Amino acid sequence: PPYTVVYFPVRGRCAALRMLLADQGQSWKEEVVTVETWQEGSLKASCLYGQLPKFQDGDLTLYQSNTILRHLGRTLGLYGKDQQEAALVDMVNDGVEDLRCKYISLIYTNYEAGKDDYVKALPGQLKPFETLLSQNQGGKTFIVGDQISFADYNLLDLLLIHEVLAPGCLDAFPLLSAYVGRLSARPKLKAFLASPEYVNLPINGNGKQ
Amino acid sequence: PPYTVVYFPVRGRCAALRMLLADQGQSWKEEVVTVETWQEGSLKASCLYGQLPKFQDGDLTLYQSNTILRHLGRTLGLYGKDQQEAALVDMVNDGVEDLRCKYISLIYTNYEAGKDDYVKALPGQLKPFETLLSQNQGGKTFIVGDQISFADYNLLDLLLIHEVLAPGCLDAFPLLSAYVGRLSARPKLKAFLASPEYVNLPINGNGKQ
Ligand SMILES: CCCCCCSC[C@H](NC(=O)CC[C@H](N)C(=O)O)C(=O)NCC(=O)O
Ligand SMILES: CCCCCCSC[C@H](NC(=O)CC[C@H](N)C(=O)O)C(=O)NCC(=O)O
């Protein structure tokens, strides 16, 4: 601590981490990089991998958003309670990553044309999480075990951006809905999701949503 | 333990955990799934994300390559020695994933037309790892401190498939070429990189490399 997030002013790949932090009583600083600024060359060359986010936890400066989330699960204890659960929250976040990366392909490289087949192909892609909840206590808790993890935060968001893509896709998936409902009902998250801070910050930055 | 790897007759995405368990003196049963068995549908409906590798470590069946790699790191002590070392081995294995994702899209989507353009972007893609290496003992040891990590194996698999695709790439990356020269040497691994079950396997299946 203190936490400092540097990203472009989109919800993007840091919505999961922002939701984590605010739910887990933590504060953070936002340092915004606009596209004009990014274009002025320096910071992209400072960034290890040319991209964003950049997290600063104290003296540690992290990159790759999944790394950032794993790191806050080790540190804050959002990573299972044993090594089986740990393996499974890995299994599940890499599930959300694979889909998230496909979403990104639509939103930036084929939205208008591809959006079509995307919401058709979606049920088979959201299928595994529906399975996962039924095995984990019949979905009345969390995707891995019975304590929130950093994987509950990255799945809940992937779910939320898709309910915006398709107002209603989660209805085919009744346990997936029960989950989002329950998790947006956790107070610190609820207060966050309803904030100016969250609401007027675009999901993808290019207009598509 | 014991370890069972369930995959197609190709190195591909099990190459790195096979290098890991071989270098660390472990042994595993390879369960070989032919395209004929994948085609006859029963295995797919068992795998949680419809795909393979599938890995059994005793009572755990785990899906997804980097989750297995991350598991063996947690279990066989190969995820660095302290909190900073772990977020950095994850930050490196992530950086690696991003470039493996682009290599499999080159290989199973459009090799022929996409290659020249791929090999054009490669120096800019390998350059982060040279850097990481220079930051630590001038790249005299490993990619994250004193001792080997899962992220060291997986990165080594990427540069070996990349030297088959673009022979001459690593020659400008001397630390990175020496890194391969020194981790290939460690004779438990070196015995494996000349075994039948490694030399007699296709990199990619599709016939491209
Ligand atoms: C203005 C709106 C842009 C919307 C996308 C913002 S994120 C774009 C990109 N970053 C990434 O790709 C982040 C991915 C990285 N692997 C991670 O997991 O953290 C990135 O920083 N790209 C900039 C670049 O490569 O030049
Ligand atoms: C049958 C074609 C010849 C074999 C080529 C190698 S197949 C490897 C491929 N696996 C993946 O894409 C799994 C990816 C998963 N994210 C992981 O962490 O590893 C995969 O399983 N896909 C095959 C499929 O979906 O049928």
From Swiss-Prot, chains A, B:
CDD domains linked to this entry: GST_C_Pi (cd03210), GST_N_Pi (cd03076)
Enzyme Commission number(s) of this protein: 2.5.1.18
GO cellular component: cytoplasm; cytosol; extracellular exosome; extracellular region; extracellular space; ficolin-1-rich granule lumen; mitochondrion; nucleus
Positions of post-translational N6-succinyllysine modification: K102, K115
Subcellular location: Cytoplasm; Mitochondrion; Nucleus
InterPro entries referenced in this protein's UniProt entry, alphabetically: Glutathione-S-Trfase_C-like (IPR010987), Glutathione-S-Trfase_C_sf (IPR036282), Glutathione_S-Trfase (IPR040079), Glutathione_S-Trfase_N (IPR004045), GST_C (IPR004046), GST_pi (IPR003082), GST_superfamily (IPR050213), Thioredoxin-like_sf (IPR036249)
Residues bearing PTM Phosphotyrosine: Y3, Y198
Chief location of this protein within or outside the cell: cytoplasm
Effect of A113V: In allele GSTP1*C
Residues annotated as domain GST N-terminal: 1-80
PTM annotation (Phosphothreonine): residues: T61
Pfam families on file: GST_C_3, GST_N
Subunit structure: Homodimer. Interacts with CDK5.
Family: Belongs to the GST superfamily. Pi family.
Function: Conjugation of reduced glutathione to a wide number of exogenous and endogenous hydrophobic electrophiles. Involved in the formation of glutathione conjugates of both prostaglandin A2 (PGA2) and prostaglandin J2 (PGJ2). Participates in the formation of novel hepoxilin regioisomers. Negatively regulates CDK5 activity via p25/p35 translocation to prevent neurodegeneration.
Protein name: Glutathione S-transferase P
